[PDB]
Amino acid sequence: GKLLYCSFCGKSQHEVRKLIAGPSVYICDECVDLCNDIIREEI
Amino acid sequence: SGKLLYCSFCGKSQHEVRKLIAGPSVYICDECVDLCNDIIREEI
Ligand SMILES: [Ca+2]
Ligand SMILES: [Zn+2]
Ligand SMILES: [Zn+2]
Structure with missing residues (x-):
C-alpha cells in the first residue's frame, strides 16, 4: 500500500x-534492460 | 579515489x-543483473 x-x-x-x-x-525491468546493454556493450 | x-x-x-x-x-553488479534477467523472463 x-x-x-x-x-x-x-x-x-x-x-x-x-x-x-x-x-x-x-x-525496474527497463533499467535491467539498460544494464544488459552496458554489460554486453551493445545496442 | 581508491x-x-x-x-x-x-x-x-x-x-x-x-x-x-x-x-x-x-x-x-553483473551477477545481480543476470539474476534480474531470470526474474523478468521467469525462467531458469
Ligand atoms: Ca581503499
Ligand atoms: Zn528503472
Ligand atoms: Zn550484485
Missing part, C-alpha cells in the same frame, strides 16, 4: 512491468 | 564482480 520507485530511474512499480527489490533498493 | 563501491543488491565490491553499474547513490 505504498508507492515504490526504481532506485536508478525513479519510475514507480505502476510505470514498469516489474520492480525487483534488493535489501534496501529497487531496479 | 574507495570501495558495493553492489546494493548482493553486497559484493567492485573487485569481486566483472562490472558494477552505478545509479544515483545505488549500484548493481
Whole structure:
C-alpha cells in the first residue's frame, strides 16, 4: 500500500512491468534492460 | 579515489564482480543483473 520507485530511474512499480527489490533498493525491468546493454556493450 | 563501491543488491565490491553499474547513490553488479534477467523472463 505504498508507492515504490526504481532506485536508478525513479519510475514507480505502476510505470514498469516489474520492480525487483534488493535489501534496501529497487531496479525496474527497463533499467535491467539498460544494464544488459552496458554489460554486453551493445545496442 | 581508491574507495570501495558495493553492489546494493548482493553486497559484493567492485573487485569481486566483472562490472558494477552505478545509479544515483545505488549500484548493481553483473551477477545481480543476470539474476534480474531470470526474474523478468521467469525462467531458469
Ligand atoms: Ca581503499
Ligand atoms: Zn528503472
Ligand atoms: Zn550484485
